[PDB]
RNA sequence: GACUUAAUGUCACGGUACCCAAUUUUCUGCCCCG
RNA sequence: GGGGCAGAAAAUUGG
């Protein structure tokens, strides 16, 4: 009969899709062709359709719902649409009774796996009680062939998560080889209350993840199991979080200079649980001080490993163009490895040490922990060789920062009083950076901020007192996006000074009349090809232009030069002659990074691309100031290349916040973004 | 302590939502999105009626925002009493949160009151908020409220029963469009309500403190928006008709089904819908087209008997029965009912199910836990705030389209649906947005989306709009768009839209794909709409000035406002005109603003207002920056789209068919040209006369097909997730097109007299030699000539970002159009729509000019056939022959199944053109049947027909259809092909007497004959194109002395062929094709001219003009993808050699129209190899092609005993080629001294023109006592056999 | 004044019904015996 | 003794 030929053709196509040898594009073409022929058969035989055809429609919709990649930091509605249509389709299948026993149990198992995936992807629509009733009826029918299908094993593990006791089914669950070690540990913990085999099989699972890519399902289910173990106050999550952190670190080791990582949602909560585990173990009493210092150093290492990369999206990965033909190849092997891992899960200079700092320096790391809603500052002192940490809260500081941001973006120069309020709130919320025990008096401080604290002025903090003293009046401050950007070997050794300039509305004609810029590379009316011709390590490069910020891709933030400007990727590729070069940028940071609407942000400016190239330091502005201030900075740097920036900020009137807030606004806007 | 009765009036369509109290609101998504709308509650049971209202909390929120803004303007004062900032936070420890939370910024100021507000005394702001009151957050008695807002109920003007939802509201789908790809992401629904009848609401406000009355009455005049519409707040002191039409449509469908004509019903439906464009007089004065003269049947379909009467009188009775619903609704309802009954009787209700395309998404209006923020904004003390208002008009420079969902889905109550359920579609596939009074509409959301798109382009950066939000976005685009207010537009025009059809082509076979017809409603061009914009802020932006200067038009510059949803086809480009900008200062003229209410709803008066009639406080704005000084212009907006404008010269007839307008217009014609309806603005009518045009879809498809054939991307089976060149330039499912096309308009249509030409065509049977039954038709194209060409001006826009290779592809497509590879319109294989030249305007960019500029013998066959020596080479002038003979091949046909495709230019195949000349050996008659009167002579004698020679604009021509039919008959007789045109009828039928292999090729499964492979069939386009022939040189006008015109001939009576003579005696079979003989039988007709104008009736014969011998005509044959043997057989069929010629025209039994075709030039081009101009193809390779064709014919015969070599072929070795070449042999060409005598018998002696003792009658030649039947059939199968002594 | 709001906090003017497709393919205004 | 044919067959929505 021709209907059976069409059905076996559709099943042949679906089993061609099931084989782990096809590419994702071939999978998309095969399953949507099978769905086309099945929907045509539906349109022909609309009410005289058999039940098994509707079952095949639901199975084809499940296979379609597998191969939809998540774009953005949310669940796409195409996946929910496919899941809800396959639920509706299998509902009118199971209301069409009197098939065989195999057809009935197959319909119940398809409905079970659809409800499981739809409950995982959406909570408010599909509650846990409906899942409990549906899976209880499905196991009342008897889908218990644990030696044939893994879907029954998934039903079993989900029911033990819900609470329906299956100690009668325990021997069949353990003896099955298709169930991997994570389901075995979950079965041993959830039913038998035996913890030792659970620890063994969890150790095997975390050992297995060290070669598995991040887009796999096992990462998501492992971190979810760790969070569930944390929620009932067990004693095994403290080891499992550290093991999964070590596995994720050794897996993320395998990337290159294009610092990317796959965006999956439970990355941050894994790092937060690992931080809380090491923090609690450091808070536990230990008579040996070296263990405690090592645990605080491990906290700093966790923070550094989080801050290292910046977690690009998926549509930005597909959207961005191709250049230099080898970074394209590394990007393409990363992308296709990640997508084939995602579908394969469902189808079946040298980096410095944390204590390698110069003498007389104090290093301060930050970590905003979203689970406890706290913020931790970790301090390393080299002269005493000691590690300490302290805590604070970050809600009211976020409110005052958003107030300053709104007032600035409406009235740029006239938000000076909100700037003073923000500096006083930094001084009130974080009082430990004025105490002598936490940070010694007269030492240079390096800040490594991680959150919206990248945008906060830390050097201009005001002490919570009557006659308040600024932070920069006794300390020299430096900044860095992450510790992995720090490098050695400055070695300027040259005396060439280069200028580039594109905008003529700013009055820099007195500056272009100068005599220091006597080399051939200095020109007005710059371009990108004129930027990539810098020959051999100038001592000071000055770029005077505007900035444009792509609000999704940090790779597309551009400096407004002629012939289309130069982007982040072109600075990473084309520019080669800038090793050991101090750079003074005229464009503000607010034009180079987009304004933020969440507590978390990870968007890197062109200054860190200059740091990845090899530059010695970048001195820039946090917000928009007058052109005369940048002119005075460039002149003071040209006459004096050895002097520090905090003396210039103190001398020009950076301590006049109580009487004239415009001078305090124009003074503290300048920031050095490079470590010696 | 006095009440205030308040009325709010809406000046725009507002938004409605269903009412749920507080928890069922959280159950629903539309209710959570639908806050700050107007609310609808049901009354009674059954979900049909109810009432609508507006809550008092919404009016309280609007009044509080207005008070805060007015206090922010005057630095925290109002009329001398200072105010504090107030409170907007609630501690969660004491009390509950007040059921609505604020996410926007709160304006604040310095509080200089030098007092803290207590319960005993407070400022006007604190007593207007209700801080120190006795009532809060739990309702009690309606006293102990210091200020109380009641609900606002709909002021129904006339008291009736309970109001229905379908009388007030109507549903609509809105959209969200991505910026990088140009495609929608998600959608959501809403209810829009009428403001003309149902836009007045009345409420009460009670105030128990005469200290904040002035601030409240001032703030009531500062509220500008409510429920999605502009507002003004003032203080006072037919089921039965559908059932009847369904019954009568059932009557019409059964009356059609009795005649076996059901498939016309579909066509009839469309025709009735087209009758909405005319008036009622087309059914009342009977202006529907009448049929041909003296015909018992009338029209094609307007004269089918329905229960005894004609269809037009039935439609008259139906219109008299249903005069109370208007003409438009009557036509639309009759068309829809006929379409529904046709779909029911056919069997398919067109289910319309879509896999994974819905994505209905509502923004999550609930606050996820956390993020309760308070953001104060403090303006500087000095700063000035102003409001700018821009008034003007929008004009459609192209036909526009604003999409809307189909009816029976835009019902507000019954939106309940399921994923599984299928959706019944309606008559029109794509509808247009209209008002309740059938007026055209530009909605607010489309204008706001286009302004957001152009502002993001002008800034160079922006955010994709996020829906679930806790913090307001601070990107530049959003900051400027939170200060812009618009207004919806309706025209003063209420005429029906125009239907435009679209198809899609199969690239392999070059015919129409299955299931690709659809129809779109478009609006007229030239329509005008009002335009109002408002901006409230501190300074006027430069980017907004750049966008406004971009949208407007002037001298030289044209407007660039793309609104709507068919932009790739060029639909929806508007221009902005009559722009006036006015300025209102708010720090000193706030009382005048409050008193005049901001001129909300009176902006129509501002357009005609003079300078001296303006109200107080409103000044003209003078510092509006010019176009050359705007820096966001000329850097971001001007290089975005670039224009290429060109002009095509067509030197042939041009036909883009309509086929429904031909049904509903007088003339009784089959295919007419395409016309447009253009609206005029000086006079408010449309226009008196239409404008002829070529569609934008057509030449968009021409460009796409040219690029796809040159690159090779048309051959791919699927284009899902594709990065090919064709999908990059011309878009796909995931990306919009990078190129936009507009129409080609005729620009020289007034230099013609009789712009349209009437050309009629017929099909000739291969056996009988006459016209086939129901195979006569007419065409009505535009009259283009080689010396009077048609000129069409067109335009297309290109985007910034194109590489050099894609510009090379576009330039190569333009060069392929210029060389003539892609003809415009229909019937291109018979010479219609052939492009003769191209021209490019001087404002085209320079690189395109350089790319288009840089891209710019006596051949004889010498073969002599040995003719039949027994008829004329033995006896010179004593024999009589028969004027037609029969050629009989065998039965077998070679059918090929690997059919050559049209989807690429293959490497081994050949393509090019042949220039040929045609010489007349006998007089030639080609009539012009457009004018039956012709010269004269109809008035003197009734009856008699007289024609002229075929001409377009006074130039004698031969049509390409005649040449194609003659060459097709010759090729099919040469290559032993099937009988292409055949008929089955009375004496069993003569379709059964034919062999089954000689039946016409139907379908591509069994294969195609060589004639159907070269010249084409219904489901396969051919690979040869014949053009119109032009007169060149020689004499003209054969002169007979005594005749009423000098260049003329009155021919003999000529009537239909009788197959009873050719096949009597039932055990007999069809003896093949019919051919005519070459002789000078026209001299008998010429000398016997007086005996023809008497002794026979003038109704029988025809008078015509003739051409003499020696005339030369020139024409062209184009070809693509030809094998070498097919080209060889074609070149042999064109020039078969010396003393062999063809037959063309009228009077072939009498000896008229012997033509000799001599090949002048052959050109072949190969575009797969890199580039060069077209070659010359010398004599050696074309002789090699003729040898390959001869070897293919030898291989097809089967007798392989004849050797192979480079010897000149003797064609008469094969039998049927010898019979054919004896039939087409001219015995008077080489200055020979013989002429035959070929004429018909006399039929029953003592009759017309019987020679004395010849015995040449049908009595003595059909009576079986001499020449029995087998000898008679054998006498017609041997060419040139004598009949008067009968061999 | 019930249906029909809660009051120290409503950016829904926070969202273009959008993207893709040649009204086309085949046809001599022709012509004799009961 | 005498005029015929005057349109026929598909596609009417799908991604
Ligand atoms: Zn107050
Ligand atoms: Zn925005
Ligand atoms: Zn493609
Ligand atoms: Zn054929």
* HEC assignment per residue over A460-472: CCECCCCCCCECC
| Rounded distance between C-alpha atoms, residue A73 and residue A264, angstroms | 8
Q: Give the DSSP letter of residue B464.
A: P
| Rounded distance between C-alpha atoms, residue B811 and residue B508, angstroms | 24
Domain ranges, ordered by start, for chain A: 1-143, 210-348
DSSP string, B795-852: EEEEETT--HHHHHHHHHHHHHHHHTSS--SS-GGGT-S-EEEEEE-TTS-HHHHHHH
| b/e burial code for range B964-982 (CB count within 10 A of at least 16 → b) | bbbbbbbbbbbbbbbbbbb
Q: Chain B residue closest to A407 (CA)?
A: B377
Q: How far is B220 from chain A (nearest CA, A)?
A: 28
Of residues B943, B922, B930, the one with CA closest to residue B1103 = B943
B356, B375, B463 member nearest A402 (Cβ)? B375
Q: How far apart are the first and last CA of chain A?
A: 80
Please classify residue A100 by burial: count the beta carbons closer than 10 Å to its beta carbon, then call 0-12 exposed, 13-18 middle and 19+ buried: exposed
Q: Where does residue B599 fall: left (phi above 0), alpha (psi -120 to 50 degrees), or beta otherwise?
A: left
Of residues B167, B499, B168, the one with CA closest to residue B331 = B499
- Alpha-helical regions (H) of A452-532: 509-512, 528-531
Q: How far apart are the first and last CA of chain B?
A: 131
Of residues B11, B13, B67, B17, the one with CA closest to residue B37 = B17
| Rounded distance between C-alpha atoms, residue B587 and residue B381, angstroms | 12
Q: For residue B629, say whether it is annotated as part of any ligand binding site.
A: no
CA of B926 to C1' of D3 (A): 21
| Rounded distance between C-alpha atoms, residue A226 and residue A210, angstroms | 17
What does CATH list as the number for A1-143? 1.25.40
Task: Take residue A274 and report the two structure tokens written for it.
Answer: 């690992």
Angle at A163 between CA A159 and CA A164, to 5 degrees: 65
- Alpha-helical regions (H) of A371-490: 395-411, 416-429
Are B1174 and B816 within 8 A, CB to CB? no
Of residues B477, B420, B470, the one with CA closest to residue B449 = B477
CA atoms within 13 A on the CB side of A183: 22
Q: Give the DSSP letter of residue B434.
A: B
Of residues B852, B886, B814, B1219, the one with CA closest to residue B1074 = B886
Q: For residue B227, say whether it is annotated as part of any ligand binding site.
A: no
Q: For residue B280, say whether it is annotated as part of any ligand binding site.
A: no
| Rounded distance between C-alpha atoms, residue A476 and residue A440, angstroms | 12
Are B131 and B401 within 8 A, CB to CB? no
Q: Which residues in B lie closer than 8 A to residue A62 (C-beta atoms)?
A: none
Task: Take residue B165 and report the two structure tokens written for it.
Answer: 């939802």
Of residues B76, B66, B70, B73, the one with CA closest to residue B109 = B76
- Kindly report the backbone phi and psi dihedral angles of residue A308, in degrees, each rounded to the nearest multiple of 5, phi listed first: -65, -50
Instruction: Say which residue the tokens 């004896």 belong to.
Output: B1222
Are B648 and B838 within 8 A, CB to CB? yes
- Kindly report the backbone phi and psi dihedral angles of residue A530, in degrees, each rounded to the nearest multiple of 5, phi listed first: -75, -20
Give the ligand whose atoms come closest to the C-alpha of residue B126: 1
Question: Which residues are near ligand 2, the ion (C-beta closer than 5 Å)?
Answer: B 463, 473, 475, 478
Are B681 and B395 within 8 A, CB to CB? yes
Cα Rg for chain B, rounded, in angstroms? Answer: 41
> Reported resolution in A?
3.0
- In A, what residues contact B, Cβ < 8 A? 25, 28-29, 32, 35-36, 39, 43, 46, 64, 77-78, 81-82, 84-85, 88-89, 92, 319, 399, 402-403, 405-407, 409-411, 414, 417-418, 548-552, 594-595, 597-598
B1061 touches strand D (CB under 7 A): no
Sorted by sequence, the CB contacts under 8 Å of residue B887 that are 6+ apart come out as B973, B1072, B1073, B1074, B1075, B1216, B1219, B1220, B1223, B1279
Angle at B732 between CA B731 and CA B735, to 5 degrees: 70
Q: Chain B residue closest to A124 (CA)?
A: B27
Beta strands in B345-466 (DSSP E): 376-377, 386-396, 403-404, 431-432, 441-442
- Asked if B471's CB is within 8 angstroms of A402's CB, the reply is yes
Angle at B395 between CA B389 and CA B399, to 5 degrees: 145
DSSP string, B563-595: EEEEGGGTEEEEEEEEEEEEEEETTT-HHHHHH
Are A556 and A550 within 8 A, CB to CB? yes
Beta strands in B747-860 (DSSP E): 759-764, 771-780, 790-799, 835-840
- Asked if B380's CB is within 8 angstroms of A414's CB, the reply is yes
| Rounded distance between C-alpha atoms, residue B593 and residue B598, angstroms | 5
Q: Which residues in A lie closer than 8 A to residue B718 (C-beta atoms)?
A: 29
Alpha carbon of residue B1021 to chain centroid: 22
Q: Which of residues 397-426 of B touch A (CB under 8 A)?
A: 418-420
B356, B379, B460 member nearest A78 (Cβ)? B356
Q: For residue B126, say whether it is annotated as part of any ligand binding site.
A: yes
Domain ranges, ordered by start, for chain B: 3-90+98-237, 240-346, 384-408+423-464+473-629, 641-854, 895-978+993-1275
Are B481 and A411 within 8 A, CB to CB? no
Instruction: Say which residue the tokens 């938004």 belong to.
Output: B15
Are B244 and B322 within 8 A, CB to CB? yes
User: Taking the CB of residue B850, how many other CB atoms lie within 10 A of it?
Assistant: 11
User: Taking the CB of residue B43, how many other CB atoms lie within 10 A of it?
Assistant: 12
Q: Which residues in A lie closer than 8 A to residue B385 (C-beta atoms)?
A: none
Beta strands in B844-997 (DSSP E): 884-887, 910-920, 945-946, 951-952, 955-958
- Kindly report the backbone phi and psi dihedral angles of residue B1126, in degrees, each rounded to the nearest multiple of 5, phi listed first: -65, -40
Which residue is closest to D5 in terms of CA–C1' distance? B773
User: Taking the CB of residue A277, how many other CB atoms lie within 10 A of it?
Assistant: 20
Are A527 and A565 within 8 A, CB to CB? no
What Cα–Cα distance (Å) separates residue A540 from each residue in A344, A456, B72? 52, 27, 49
The SS3 of residue B299 is coil
The SS3 of residue B532 is strand
| Rounded distance between C-alpha atoms, residue B1258 and residue B1253, angstroms | 14
List beta partners, residue B386.
B537, B585
| Rounded distance between C-alpha atoms, residue B361 and residue B188, angstroms | 6
Q: Which residues in B lie closer than 8 A to residue A313 (C-beta atoms)?
A: none
List beta partners, residue B949.
B927
Of residues B1024, B1002, B1009, B1017, the one with CA closest to residue B978 = B1009
């Amino acid at each position: 009969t021709r209907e059976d030929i069409d059905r076996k053709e559709a099943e042949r196509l679906l089993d061609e899709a099931f084989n782990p040898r096809t590419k994702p594009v071939d999978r998309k073409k095969i399953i949507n062709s099978a769905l086309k022929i099945l929907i045509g058969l539906y349109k022909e035989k609309k009410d005289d359709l058999t039940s098994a055809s509707f079952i095949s429609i639901a199975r084809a919709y499940y296979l379609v719902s597998i191969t939809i990649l998540p774009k953005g930091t949310t669940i796409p509605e195409k996946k929910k649409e496919a899941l809800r249509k396959g639920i509706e389709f299998i509902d009118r299948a199971i209301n069409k009774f009197n098939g065989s026993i195999l057809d009935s149990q197959r319909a119940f198992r398809i409905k079970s796996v659809l409800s499981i995936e739809f409950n995982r992807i959406d909570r408010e629509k599909c509650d846990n009680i409906k899942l409990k009733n549906l899976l209880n009826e499905a196991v009342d029918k008897g889908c218990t062939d644990f030696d044939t299908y893994e879907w029954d094993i998934q039903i079993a593990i989900r029911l033990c998560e819900l609470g329906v006791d299956m100690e009668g089914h325990f021997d069949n669950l353990i003896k099955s080889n298709k169930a991997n070690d994570l389901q075995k540990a979950k079965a041993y913990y959830f039913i038998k209350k035996d913890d030792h085999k659970a620890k063994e099989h969890m150790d095997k699972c975390t050992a297995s993840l060290k070669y598995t890519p991040c887009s796999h399902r096992l990462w998501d289910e492992t971190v979810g199991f760790i969070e569930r173990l944390k929620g009932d106050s067990s004693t095994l999550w403290r080891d499992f979080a550290i093991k999964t952190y070590r596995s994720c670190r050794v897996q993320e080791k395998e990337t290159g200079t294009l610092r990317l990582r796959w965006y999956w949602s439970r990355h941050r909560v894994l790092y937060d649980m690992a931080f809380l585990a090491v923090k609690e173990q450091a808070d536990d009493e230990e008579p040996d001080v070296n263990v405690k210092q090592a645990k605080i150093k491990k906290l700093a290492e966790i923070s550094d490993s989080l801050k290292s990369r910046f977690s690009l999206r998926l549509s930005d990965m597909e959207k961005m163009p191709k250049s230099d033909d080898e970074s394209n190849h590394e990007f393409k092997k990363f992308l296709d490895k990640c997508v084939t891992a995602y579908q394969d899960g469902y189808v079946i200079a040298k980096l410095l040490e944390l204590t390698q700092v110069p003498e007389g320096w104090v290093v301060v790391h930050f970590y905003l922990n979203k689970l406890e809603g706290m913020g931790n500052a970790i301090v390393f002192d080299k002269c005493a060789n000691s590690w300490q940490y302290k805590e604070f809260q970050y809600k009211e500081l976020f409110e005052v920062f958003l107030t300053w941001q709104a007032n600035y973006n409406l009235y740029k120069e006239n938000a000076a009083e909100h700037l003073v309020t923000l500096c006083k709130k930094i001084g009130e919320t974080m009082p430990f950076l004025f105490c002598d025990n936490f940070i010694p008096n007269g030492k240079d401080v390096l800040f490594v901020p991680h959150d919206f604290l990248h945008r906060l002025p830390l050097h201009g903090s005001i002490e919570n007192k009557t006659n308040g003293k600024l932070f920069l009046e006794n300390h020299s401050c430096c900044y860095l996006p992450a510790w992995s950007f720090a490098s050695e070997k400055e070695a300027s050794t040259s005396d060439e000074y280069v200028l580039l300039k594109n905008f003529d509305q700013g009055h820099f004609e007195t500056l272009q009349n100068n005599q220091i810029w006597g080399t051939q590379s200095v020109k007005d009316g710059a371009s990108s090809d004129d930027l990539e011709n810098i020959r051999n390590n100038p001592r000071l490069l000055t770029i005077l232009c505007h900035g444009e910020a792509n609000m999704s891709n940090p790779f597309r933030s551009m400096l407004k030069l002629a012939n289309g400007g130069i982007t982040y990727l072109e600075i990473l590729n084309s520019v080669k002659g800038l090793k050991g070069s101090q750079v003074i940028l005229g464009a503000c940071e607010t034009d180079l990074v987009p304004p933020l609407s969440d507590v978390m942000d990870e968007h890197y400016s062109v200054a860190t691309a200059l740091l990845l190239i090899g530059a010695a330091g970048v001195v820039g502005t946090m917000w928009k100031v007058r052109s005369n201030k940048t002119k005075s900075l460039i002149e003071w740097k040209l006459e004096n290349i050895e002097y520090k920036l905090n003396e210039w900020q103190k001398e020009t009137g950076g301590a006049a916040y109580k009487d004239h807030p415009p001078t305090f606004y124009r003074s503290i806007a300048f920031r050095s973004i490079g470590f010696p | 302590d006095m009440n205030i009765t308040v009325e709010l009036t809406f000046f725009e369509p507002y938004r409605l939502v269903e009412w749920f109290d507080w928890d069922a609101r959280k159950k629903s998504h539309s209710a959570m999105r639908g806050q700050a709308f107007a609310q609808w509650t049901w009354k009674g049971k059954g979900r049909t009626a109810g009432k609508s209202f507006i809550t008092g909390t919404l009016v309280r929120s609007a009044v509080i925002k207005a008070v805060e803004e007015l206090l922010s303007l005057n630095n925290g004062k109002w009329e001398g009493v200072p105010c504090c900032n107030g409170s907007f936070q609630t501690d969660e420890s004491k009390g509950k949160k007040p059921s609505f939370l604020r996410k926007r910024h709160t304006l604040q100021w310095q509080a200089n009151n030098k007092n803290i507000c207590d319960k005993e005394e407070a400022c006007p702001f604190c007593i207007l908020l209700g801080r120190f009151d006795n009532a809060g957050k739990v309702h009690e008695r309606n006293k102990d409220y210091d200020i109380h807002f009641s609900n606002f109920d709909l002021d129904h003007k006339q008291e009736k029963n309970d109001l229905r939802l379908v009388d007030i509201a109507s549903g609509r789908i809105l959209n969200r469009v991505d910026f990088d790809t140009g495609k929608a992401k998600d959608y959501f629904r809403t209810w829009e309500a009428d403001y003309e009848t149902y836009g007045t609401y009345t409420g009460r406000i009670t105030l128990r403190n005469e200290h904040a009355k002035k601030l409240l009455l001032a703030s009531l005049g500062f509220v500008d928006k409510l429920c999605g519409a502009l507002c003004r707040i003032e203080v006072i002191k037919s089921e039965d008709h559908n059932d009847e039409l369904r019954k009568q449509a059932e009557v019409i469908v059964e009356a059609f089904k009795q005649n076996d004509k059901l498939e016309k019903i579909r066509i009839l439906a469309d025709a009735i819908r087209t009758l909405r464009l005319h008036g009622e007089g087309v059914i009342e004065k009977d202006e529907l087209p009448d049929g041909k003269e003296e015909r018992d049947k009338g029209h094609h379909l307007w004269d089918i008997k329905v229960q005894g009467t004609a269809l037009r009188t039935k439609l008259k009775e139906l219109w008299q029965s249903n005069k109370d619903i208007g003409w438009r609704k009557f036509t639309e309802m009759l068309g829809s009912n006929l379409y529904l009954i046709y779909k029911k009787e056919t069997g398919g209700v067109s289910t319309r199910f879509r896999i994974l395309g819905d994505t209905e998404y509502y923004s999550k209006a609930h606050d996820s836990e956390g993020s309760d923020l308070f953001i104060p904004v403090t303006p500087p003390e000095g700063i000035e705030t102003k409001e700018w208002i821009i008034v003007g008009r929008l004009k459609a420079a192209t036909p526009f389209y604003f999409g809307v969902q189909q009816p029976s889905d835009s019902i507000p109550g019954k939106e309940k649906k399921s994923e599984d359920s299928l959706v019944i579609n309606e008559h029109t596939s794509f509808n247009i947005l209209l008002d309740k009074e059938n007026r055209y509409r530009i909605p607010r959301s489309a204008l706001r989306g286009a302004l957001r798109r152009d502002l993001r382009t002008a800034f160079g950066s922006g955010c994709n709009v996020s829906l679930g939000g806790q913090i307001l976005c601070n990107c530049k685009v959003c900051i400027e768009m939170r200060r812009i207010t618009l207004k919806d537009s309706v025209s003063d025009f209420s005429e029906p839209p125009e239907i435009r059809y679209r198809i899609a082509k199969n690239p392999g076979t070059a015919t129409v794909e299955d299931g690709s017809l659809f129809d779109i409603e478009v609006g007229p061009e030239g329509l005008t709409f009002p335009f109002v914009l408002r901006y409230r802020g501190h300074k006027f932006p430069e980017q907004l000035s750049s966008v406004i200067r971009y949208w407007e038009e002037n001298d030289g510059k044209n407007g660039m406002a793309w609104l709507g949803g068919l932009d790739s086809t060029g639909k929806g480009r508007f221009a902005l005109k009559d722009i006036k900008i006015f300025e209102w200062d708010l720090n000193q003229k706030i009382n005048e603003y409050i008193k005049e209410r901001g001129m909300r709803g009176k902006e129509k008066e501002l357009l005609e207002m003079g300078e001296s009639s303006l109200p107080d406080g409103l000044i003209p704005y003078k510092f509006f920056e010019e176009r050359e000084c705007l820096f966001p212009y000329k850097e971001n907006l001007k290089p975005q789209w670039s224009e290429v404008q060109y002009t095509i010269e067509v030197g042939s007839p041009l036909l883009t068919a309509d086929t429904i307008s031909a049904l509903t217009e007088p003339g009784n014609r089959d295919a007419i040209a395409y016309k447009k309806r253009v609206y005029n603005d000086g006079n408010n009518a449309i226009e008196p006369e239409p404008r002829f045009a070529v569609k934008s879809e057509t030449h968009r498809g021409i460009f796409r097909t040219a690029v796809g054939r040159r690159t090779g991307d048309l051959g791919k089976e699927d284009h899902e997730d594709c990065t090919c060149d064709m999908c990059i330039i011309f878009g796909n499912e995931h990306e919009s097109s990078k190129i936009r096309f507009e129409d080609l308009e005729l620009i020289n249509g007034n230099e013609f007299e009789k712009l349209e030409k009437h050309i009629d065509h017929v099909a000739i049977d291969r056996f009988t030699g006459g016209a086939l039954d129901k195979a006569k038709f007419d065409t009505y194209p535009l009259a283009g000539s080689p010396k009077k060409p048609l000129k069409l001006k067109g335009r297309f826009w290109i985007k910034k970002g194109f590489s050099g290779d894609h510009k090379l592809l576009i330039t190569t497509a333009l060069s392929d159009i210029r060389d003539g590879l892609y003809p415009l319109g229909s019937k291109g294989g018979v010479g219609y729509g052939w492009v003769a030249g191209i021209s490019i305007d001087d404002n085209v960019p320079d690189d395109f000019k350089e790319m288009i500029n840089k891209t710019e013998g006596p051949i004889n066959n010498d073969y002599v056939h040995p003719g039949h020596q027994s008829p004329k080479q033995d006896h010179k002038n004593k024999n009589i022959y028969y004027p037609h003979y029969f050629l009989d091949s065998g039965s077998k046909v070679y059918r090929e199944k690997d059919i050559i495709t049209h989807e690429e230019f293959t490497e081994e195949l050949l393509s090019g053109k042949i220039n040929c000349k045609l010489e007349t050996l006998t007089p030639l008659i080609i009539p012009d049947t457009s004018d039956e009167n012709g010269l004269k002579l109809q008035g003197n004698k009734p009856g008699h027909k007289n024609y002229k020679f075929f001409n377009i604009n006074g130039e004698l021509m031969i049509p390409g259809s005649e040449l194609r039919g003659m060459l097709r008959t010759h090729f099919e007789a040469l290559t032993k092909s099937c009988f292409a045109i055949f008929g089955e009828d009375s004496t069993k039928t003569l379709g059964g007497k034919l062999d089954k292999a000689l039946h016409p090729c139907t379908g591509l499964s069994d294969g195609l004959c060589p004639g159907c492979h070269l010249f084409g069939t219904t489901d396969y386009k051919g690979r040869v194109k014949f053009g119109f022939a032009k007169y060149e040189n020689g004499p003209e006008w054969l002169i007979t002395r005594g005749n009423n015109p000098e260049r003329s001939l009155t021919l003999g009576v000529l009537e239909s062929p009788r197959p009873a003579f050719s096949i009597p005696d039932d055990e007999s079979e069809i003896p093949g094709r019919k051919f005519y003989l070459h002789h000078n039988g026209w001299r008998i007709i010429r000398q016997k001219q007086l005996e023809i104008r008497e002794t026979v009736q003038p109704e029988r014969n025809v008078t015509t003009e003739v051409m003499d011998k020696g005339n030369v005509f020139s024409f062209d044959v184009r070809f693509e993808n030809l094998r070498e043997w097919e080209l060889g057989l074609l070149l042999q069929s064109l020039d078969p050699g010396k003393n062999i010629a063809h037959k063309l025209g009228k009077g072939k039994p009498y000896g008229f129209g012997s033509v000799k075709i001599k090949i002048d030039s052959l050109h072949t081009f190969k575009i797969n190899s890199n580039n060069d101009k077209i070659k010359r193809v010398p004599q050696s390779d074309i002789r090699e092609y003729i040898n390959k064709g001869y070897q293919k014919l030898i291989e097809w015969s089967g007798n392989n005993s004849i050797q192979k070599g480079n010897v000149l072929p003797q064609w008469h070795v094969i039998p049927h080629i010898d019979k054919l070449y004896k039939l087409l042999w001219v015995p008077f060409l080489n200055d020979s001294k013989l002429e035959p005598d070929v004429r018909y018998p006399v039929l029953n002696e003592e009759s017309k023109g019987y020679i004395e003792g010849s015995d040449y009658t049908y009595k003595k030649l059909g009576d079986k006592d001499n020449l029995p039947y087998k000898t008679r059939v054998k006498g017609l199968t041997t060419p040139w056999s004598p009949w008067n002594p009968f061999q």
